[PDB]
Amino acid sequence: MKIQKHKEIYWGSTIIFHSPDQVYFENLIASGQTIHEWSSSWNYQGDRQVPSLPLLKRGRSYSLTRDMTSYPSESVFLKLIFFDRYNREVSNHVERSDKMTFTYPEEAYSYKVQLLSAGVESFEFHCLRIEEIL
Amino acid sequence: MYYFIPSWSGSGKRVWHRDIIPWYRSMQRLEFDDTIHQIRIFHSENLPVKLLLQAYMPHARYFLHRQDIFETEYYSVFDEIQAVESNDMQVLQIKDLEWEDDCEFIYTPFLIIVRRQGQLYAHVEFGVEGFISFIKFFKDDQLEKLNIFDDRGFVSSIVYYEDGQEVCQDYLNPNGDWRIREYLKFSHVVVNPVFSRDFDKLEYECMPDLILEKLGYYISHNVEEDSRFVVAAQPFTNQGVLDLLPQHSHSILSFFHERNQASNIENLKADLEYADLVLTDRMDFKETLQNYFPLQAEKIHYLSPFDTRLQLGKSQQRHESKIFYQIDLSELLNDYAIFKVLFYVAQHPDTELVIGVYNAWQEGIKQVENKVEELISDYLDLKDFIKKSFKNNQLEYRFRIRNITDELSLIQELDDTRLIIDLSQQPNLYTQIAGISAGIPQINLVASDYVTHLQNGYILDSISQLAVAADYYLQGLKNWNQALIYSIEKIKLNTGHQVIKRWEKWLKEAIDEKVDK
């Protein structure tokens, strides 16, 4: 195998896959609802929905970055949820912008990031980026 | 600072090689550890600590994480051997491997079957957390290759198959170039010439030699002067590692029952003489050592481990008293004991029952299910097992049967559990640890270091008395609470700064004994 290294997080139903690194979308999704979700964990053992997001360190601080453009401009939001070991929520941050900095809480066992929605007509999506900051 | 050298092994003859197991064949043998207990103490009470890993663990990130020590700094023998430079993890999707164009995929509920032009090409299996764990490769209905993936997102290793048998395994670098090759027939390990820069010796006879090499080189050239080494007592002899320790350093030797229950006291003599400090998680093993080796009695101390992944129990937020009843299915079924519990739950309509079965395969779970159905049908009424939620609004029952595969499984189940019953002759050790950790009382048939009679739980004479035990904690609030108290002030004096304090004090007390001669 060649494995195809990259440190970016890709996408993985008008959802059109014009490339691994670019995805088209047309609205179907209520304002406030979820357009997509990434998780650092399996929802249940059998699940064919495999984790996408890397393991994080507690107390440390990171930068979550969208690389996408939404046709009705500032329409797609970016929610970030931290869950504990019992699957109960811990905390949630939403960001209108395309960059966000959070500090990974010390109760957090896993995390998910969702793309939420304002009135979104269409978007082109490239990726997410997480790197450690200070 | 403090260095920890864990004993994290495989179960084969290659002990330095951790087992690779698909998510479904997964079963519970104890993964929590005296080491993990200790390292966790250093991370709260923020002290500096580092981990020295001598074993091959392609999936060690999820392991550390799952065990709540992901933030610990580690040096890894096989990370040097394979020239893994960055700890950056890229969670691999199947989509980005990638395969030939003709490959079609078929999704088993267990794995993924890749066929190309109708012929079986590959099985893609997953690990308990859901990352690609390994892929089997096929050439004409014959297994030829096995790729083992690193949880950081590359091919860590390849096993080659001759006539359907392991012949050879080479360990790649994250770029794909083999660095060492290991021959698995009785028999050595060869270094790839291109990378001779990083290995003194060009070939090694047994794998532990190359291991012993890289480890000692770290301890000599990279350890800050006067440090402290906590060594998990490995199954055989500790000379391998003890005789690599600095001239000026303190050594702590740590004994965990699950690991060292079976060891003859005679071969301990060498390692027990060297060690500055000795720790056991069993009182009577401390005593066994203090009698056979009376000259070193003073340096052996008892320390009980506790899993702090367990939040304290939220069973006060429930009207229903939930009962966790443990069944070891390697012992077959015991109709008398299953019935005494089923009968107690029938009588007290304010209770729910989870029957936690471990060491069981899919079909053995069904056996437990039928035996419960049967016993209920023949002697009781199934209608008395319908839950309030369902019959106060009118199917769903007050009892169900859960397969306990993970420790995580059990941790979840214990969150709202009010009472633990284990009627085996050897009670699942992790459940005893998890029980006292979450502050839930326990009923066992044999005494232990985690359950104190009429304080922490009840120690039954025979299962005939099961109701007297059950009542003691299920009836009223007083006893159940005097037990949360007892359990809490026992979690306290075994996971504070207090414990490391006691270690430093015990190290000073071991010097003041040397001056006596």
Side-chain angles (χ1 to χ4, degrees), chain B residues 328-361:
Chain B
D328 184 9
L329 205 60
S330 59
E331 284 188 10
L332 294 180
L333 300 160
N334 176 5
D335 295 19
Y336 303 80
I338 293 169
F339 187 77
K340 216 84 178 59
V341 169
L342 277 180
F343 176 82
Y344 186 95
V345 174
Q347 276 196 323
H348 300 84
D350 277 328
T351 58
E352 299 191 311
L353 183 65
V354 179
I355 299 174
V357 183
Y358 77 114
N359 285 330
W361 297 47

Short mmCIF file of all heavy atoms in Angstrom, two decimals, chain B residues 328-361:
data_model
loop_
_atom_site.label_atom_id
_atom_site.label_comp_id
_atom_site.label_asym_id
_atom_site.label_seq_id
_atom_site.Cartn_x
_atom_site.Cartn_y
_atom_site.Cartn_z
N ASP B 328 -18.94 -15.42 35.10
CA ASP B 328 -17.76 -15.86 34.33
C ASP B 328 -18.16 -17.06 33.46
O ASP B 328 -18.41 -18.14 33.98
CB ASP B 328 -16.67 -16.25 35.33
CG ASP B 328 -15.37 -16.61 34.67
OD1 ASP B 328 -15.23 -16.42 33.43
OD2 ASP B 328 -14.48 -17.09 35.42
N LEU B 329 -18.26 -16.88 32.16
CA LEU B 329 -18.82 -17.98 31.37
C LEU B 329 -17.76 -19.00 30.95
O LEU B 329 -18.03 -19.90 30.17
CB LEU B 329 -19.64 -17.48 30.16
CG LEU B 329 -20.69 -18.52 29.72
CD1 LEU B 329 -21.64 -18.81 30.84
CD2 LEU B 329 -21.44 -18.09 28.50
N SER B 330 -16.56 -18.87 31.48
CA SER B 330 -15.57 -19.92 31.30
C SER B 330 -15.84 -21.02 32.33
O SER B 330 -15.23 -22.07 32.26
CB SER B 330 -14.17 -19.37 31.46
OG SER B 330 -14.02 -18.79 32.73
N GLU B 331 -16.75 -20.78 33.27
CA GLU B 331 -17.06 -21.74 34.33
C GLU B 331 -18.39 -22.49 34.07
O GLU B 331 -18.93 -23.19 34.97
CB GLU B 331 -17.11 -21.04 35.70
CG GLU B 331 -15.77 -20.66 36.36
CD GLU B 331 -15.94 -20.14 37.83
OE1 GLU B 331 -17.05 -20.25 38.40
OE2 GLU B 331 -14.95 -19.62 38.43
N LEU B 332 -18.93 -22.35 32.86
CA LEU B 332 -20.29 -22.84 32.59
C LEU B 332 -21.35 -22.23 33.57
O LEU B 332 -21.02 -21.39 34.42
CB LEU B 332 -20.33 -24.37 32.56
CG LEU B 332 -19.52 -24.97 31.41
CD1 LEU B 332 -19.57 -26.47 31.40
CD2 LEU B 332 -20.01 -24.46 30.09
N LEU B 333 -22.62 -22.60 33.45
CA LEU B 333 -23.65 -21.93 34.25
C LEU B 333 -23.86 -22.60 35.59
O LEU B 333 -23.69 -23.82 35.70
CB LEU B 333 -24.97 -21.86 33.50
CG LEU B 333 -24.87 -21.10 32.18
CD1 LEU B 333 -26.02 -21.48 31.30
CD2 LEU B 333 -24.86 -19.63 32.44
N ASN B 334 -24.22 -21.81 36.60
CA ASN B 334 -24.59 -22.37 37.90
C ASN B 334 -26.06 -22.06 38.20
O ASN B 334 -26.36 -21.00 38.72
CB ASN B 334 -23.71 -21.77 38.97
CG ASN B 334 -24.09 -22.19 40.35
OD1 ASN B 334 -24.97 -23.01 40.54
ND2 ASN B 334 -23.41 -21.65 41.34
N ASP B 335 -26.96 -23.00 37.88
CA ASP B 335 -28.38 -22.75 38.02
C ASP B 335 -28.78 -22.29 39.41
O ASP B 335 -29.62 -21.41 39.54
CB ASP B 335 -29.20 -23.94 37.61
CG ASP B 335 -29.06 -24.26 36.14
OD1 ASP B 335 -28.07 -23.79 35.54
OD2 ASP B 335 -29.93 -24.99 35.59
N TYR B 336 -28.17 -22.85 40.46
CA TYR B 336 -28.51 -22.41 41.81
C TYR B 336 -28.20 -20.95 42.04
O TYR B 336 -29.01 -20.23 42.62
CB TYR B 336 -27.84 -23.25 42.88
CG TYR B 336 -28.20 -24.70 42.72
CD1 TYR B 336 -27.55 -25.49 41.77
CD2 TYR B 336 -29.21 -25.27 43.48
CE1 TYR B 336 -27.89 -26.82 41.59
CE2 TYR B 336 -29.55 -26.61 43.31
CZ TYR B 336 -28.89 -27.38 42.36
OH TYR B 336 -29.22 -28.70 42.18
N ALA B 337 -27.05 -20.48 41.57
CA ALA B 337 -26.69 -19.11 41.86
C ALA B 337 -27.44 -18.14 40.98
O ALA B 337 -27.83 -17.07 41.43
CB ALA B 337 -25.22 -18.90 41.74
N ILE B 338 -27.64 -18.50 39.72
CA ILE B 338 -28.47 -17.68 38.85
C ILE B 338 -29.87 -17.58 39.43
O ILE B 338 -30.47 -16.52 39.44
CB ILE B 338 -28.52 -18.26 37.46
CG1 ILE B 338 -27.13 -18.14 36.84
CG2 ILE B 338 -29.54 -17.55 36.60
CD1 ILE B 338 -27.00 -18.90 35.57
N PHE B 339 -30.39 -18.67 39.96
CA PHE B 339 -31.74 -18.62 40.50
C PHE B 339 -31.88 -17.80 41.78
O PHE B 339 -32.90 -17.17 41.97
CB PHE B 339 -32.34 -20.01 40.68
CG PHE B 339 -33.78 -19.98 41.08
CD1 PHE B 339 -34.75 -19.73 40.15
CD2 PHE B 339 -34.15 -20.20 42.39
CE1 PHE B 339 -36.07 -19.69 40.52
CE2 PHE B 339 -35.47 -20.17 42.76
CZ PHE B 339 -36.43 -19.91 41.83
N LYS B 340 -30.88 -17.79 42.65
CA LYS B 340 -30.99 -17.05 43.90
C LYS B 340 -31.03 -15.54 43.60
O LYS B 340 -31.65 -14.78 44.31
CB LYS B 340 -29.82 -17.39 44.81
CG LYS B 340 -30.15 -17.44 46.26
CD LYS B 340 -30.70 -18.79 46.61
CE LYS B 340 -31.02 -18.94 48.09
NZ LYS B 340 -32.02 -17.92 48.53
N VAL B 341 -30.37 -15.12 42.54
CA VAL B 341 -30.39 -13.72 42.17
C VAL B 341 -31.71 -13.41 41.51
O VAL B 341 -32.39 -12.49 41.92
CB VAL B 341 -29.23 -13.35 41.21
CG1 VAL B 341 -29.43 -11.97 40.65
CG2 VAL B 341 -27.91 -13.42 41.92
N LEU B 342 -32.07 -14.18 40.48
CA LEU B 342 -33.36 -14.03 39.80
C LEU B 342 -34.52 -14.00 40.78
O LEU B 342 -35.47 -13.27 40.59
CB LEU B 342 -33.60 -15.17 38.84
CG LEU B 342 -32.99 -15.07 37.46
CD1 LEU B 342 -33.36 -16.30 36.69
CD2 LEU B 342 -33.46 -13.84 36.78
N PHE B 343 -34.44 -14.81 41.84
CA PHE B 343 -35.51 -14.87 42.83
C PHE B 343 -35.55 -13.62 43.68
O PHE B 343 -36.62 -13.18 44.07
CB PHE B 343 -35.37 -16.08 43.74
CG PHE B 343 -36.39 -16.14 44.85
CD1 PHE B 343 -37.66 -16.63 44.61
CD2 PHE B 343 -36.09 -15.70 46.12
CE1 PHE B 343 -38.60 -16.68 45.63
CE2 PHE B 343 -37.03 -15.75 47.12
CZ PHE B 343 -38.28 -16.24 46.88
N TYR B 344 -34.39 -13.06 43.99
CA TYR B 344 -34.33 -11.83 44.79
C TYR B 344 -34.93 -10.68 43.99
O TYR B 344 -35.63 -9.84 44.52
CB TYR B 344 -32.90 -11.51 45.24
CG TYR B 344 -32.83 -10.35 46.17
CD1 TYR B 344 -32.83 -10.52 47.53
CD2 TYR B 344 -32.76 -9.06 45.68
CE1 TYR B 344 -32.76 -9.44 48.38
CE2 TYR B 344 -32.70 -7.97 46.51
CZ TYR B 344 -32.71 -8.16 47.86
OH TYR B 344 -32.66 -7.05 48.68
N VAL B 345 -34.64 -10.66 42.70
CA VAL B 345 -35.11 -9.59 41.86
C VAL B 345 -36.61 -9.70 41.60
O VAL B 345 -37.29 -8.70 41.39
CB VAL B 345 -34.31 -9.52 40.56
CG1 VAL B 345 -34.89 -8.50 39.61
CG2 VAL B 345 -32.87 -9.19 40.89
N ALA B 346 -37.13 -10.92 41.63
CA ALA B 346 -38.56 -11.10 41.44
C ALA B 346 -39.28 -10.51 42.64
O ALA B 346 -40.21 -9.76 42.49
CB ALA B 346 -38.88 -12.56 41.28
N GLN B 347 -38.80 -10.84 43.83
CA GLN B 347 -39.43 -10.40 45.07
C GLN B 347 -39.42 -8.91 45.26
O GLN B 347 -40.36 -8.38 45.81
CB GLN B 347 -38.73 -11.01 46.26
CG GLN B 347 -39.16 -12.39 46.65
CD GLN B 347 -38.68 -12.73 48.08
OE1 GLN B 347 -37.56 -12.34 48.49
NE2 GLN B 347 -39.54 -13.41 48.85
N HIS B 348 -38.35 -8.22 44.87
CA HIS B 348 -38.24 -6.79 45.15
C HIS B 348 -38.39 -6.00 43.88
O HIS B 348 -37.43 -5.88 43.12
CB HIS B 348 -36.90 -6.47 45.78
CG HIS B 348 -36.66 -7.18 47.06
ND1 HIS B 348 -36.17 -8.46 47.12
CD2 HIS B 348 -36.89 -6.80 48.35
CE1 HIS B 348 -36.08 -8.85 48.39
NE2 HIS B 348 -36.51 -7.85 49.15
N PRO B 349 -39.59 -5.43 43.67
CA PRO B 349 -39.98 -4.93 42.35
C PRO B 349 -39.32 -3.60 42.07
O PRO B 349 -39.45 -3.06 40.97
CB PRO B 349 -41.50 -4.77 42.48
CG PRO B 349 -41.86 -5.26 43.90
CD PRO B 349 -40.60 -5.12 44.69
N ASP B 350 -38.61 -3.09 43.07
CA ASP B 350 -37.89 -1.83 42.93
C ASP B 350 -36.46 -2.00 42.45
O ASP B 350 -35.66 -1.08 42.55
CB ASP B 350 -37.93 -1.04 44.24
CG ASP B 350 -39.22 -0.24 44.42
OD1 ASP B 350 -39.79 0.22 43.39
OD2 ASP B 350 -39.66 -0.07 45.58
N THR B 351 -36.12 -3.18 41.95
CA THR B 351 -34.76 -3.48 41.55
C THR B 351 -34.70 -3.87 40.09
O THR B 351 -35.63 -4.45 39.55
CB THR B 351 -34.17 -4.63 42.36
OG1 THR B 351 -35.00 -5.77 42.19
CG2 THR B 351 -34.10 -4.28 43.82
N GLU B 352 -33.59 -3.54 39.44
CA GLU B 352 -33.35 -3.98 38.08
C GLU B 352 -32.10 -4.82 38.11
O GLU B 352 -31.29 -4.69 39.03
CB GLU B 352 -33.14 -2.77 37.18
CG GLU B 352 -34.33 -1.85 37.15
CD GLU B 352 -34.25 -0.80 36.06
OE1 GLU B 352 -33.17 -0.15 35.97
OE2 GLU B 352 -35.25 -0.64 35.31
N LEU B 353 -31.93 -5.68 37.12
CA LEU B 353 -30.81 -6.62 37.13
C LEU B 353 -30.08 -6.56 35.82
O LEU B 353 -30.70 -6.75 34.78
CB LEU B 353 -31.34 -8.03 37.33
CG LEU B 353 -30.30 -9.13 37.44
CD1 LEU B 353 -29.48 -8.93 38.68
CD2 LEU B 353 -30.94 -10.51 37.45
N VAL B 354 -28.78 -6.29 35.85
CA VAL B 354 -27.97 -6.53 34.65
C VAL B 354 -27.15 -7.75 34.93
O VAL B 354 -26.48 -7.80 35.95
CB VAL B 354 -26.98 -5.42 34.32
CG1 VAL B 354 -26.21 -5.81 33.09
CG2 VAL B 354 -27.70 -4.15 34.05
N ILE B 355 -27.22 -8.73 34.05
CA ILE B 355 -26.33 -9.86 34.19
C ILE B 355 -25.16 -9.63 33.25
O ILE B 355 -25.30 -9.71 32.02
CB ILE B 355 -27.03 -11.19 33.90
CG1 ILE B 355 -28.17 -11.42 34.87
CG2 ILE B 355 -26.06 -12.33 34.04
CD1 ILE B 355 -28.97 -12.62 34.54
N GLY B 356 -24.02 -9.31 33.84
CA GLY B 356 -22.80 -9.08 33.08
C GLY B 356 -22.01 -10.36 32.85
O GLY B 356 -21.52 -10.98 33.79
N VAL B 357 -21.90 -10.77 31.61
CA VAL B 357 -21.24 -12.02 31.31
C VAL B 357 -19.88 -11.71 30.70
O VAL B 357 -19.81 -10.94 29.74
CB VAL B 357 -22.06 -12.84 30.30
CG1 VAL B 357 -21.41 -14.16 30.06
CG2 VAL B 357 -23.44 -13.05 30.81
N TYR B 358 -18.81 -12.26 31.26
CA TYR B 358 -17.52 -12.13 30.57
C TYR B 358 -16.92 -13.48 30.25
O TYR B 358 -17.35 -14.49 30.80
CB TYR B 358 -16.51 -11.22 31.31
CG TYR B 358 -15.84 -11.83 32.51
CD1 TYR B 358 -14.47 -12.09 32.52
CD2 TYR B 358 -16.57 -12.11 33.67
CE1 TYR B 358 -13.84 -12.64 33.66
CE2 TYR B 358 -15.96 -12.66 34.81
CZ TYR B 358 -14.60 -12.92 34.81
OH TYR B 358 -14.03 -13.47 35.95
N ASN B 359 -15.93 -13.47 29.37
CA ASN B 359 -15.36 -14.70 28.83
C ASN B 359 -16.43 -15.44 28.09
O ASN B 359 -16.59 -16.65 28.27
CB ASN B 359 -14.79 -15.60 29.92
CG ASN B 359 -13.48 -15.10 30.47
OD1 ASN B 359 -12.70 -14.43 29.77
ND2 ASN B 359 -13.21 -15.42 31.73
N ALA B 360 -17.19 -14.75 27.26
CA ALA B 360 -18.24 -15.44 26.55
C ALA B 360 -18.22 -15.09 25.09
O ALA B 360 -17.95 -13.96 24.71
CB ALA B 360 -19.56 -15.10 27.15
N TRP B 361 -18.54 -16.09 24.27
CA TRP B 361 -18.70 -15.90 22.83
C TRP B 361 -20.17 -15.73 22.55
O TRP B 361 -20.98 -15.99 23.41
CB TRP B 361 -18.16 -17.11 22.07
CG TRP B 361 -16.69 -17.32 22.27
CD1 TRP B 361 -15.98 -17.30 23.45
CD2 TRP B 361 -15.76 -17.61 21.26
NE1 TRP B 361 -14.65 -17.55 23.22
CE2 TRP B 361 -14.49 -17.74 21.87
CE3 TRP B 361 -15.86 -17.77 19.89
CZ2 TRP B 361 -13.35 -18.02 21.16
CZ3 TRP B 361 -14.74 -18.05 19.18
CH2 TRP B 361 -13.49 -18.18 19.81
#
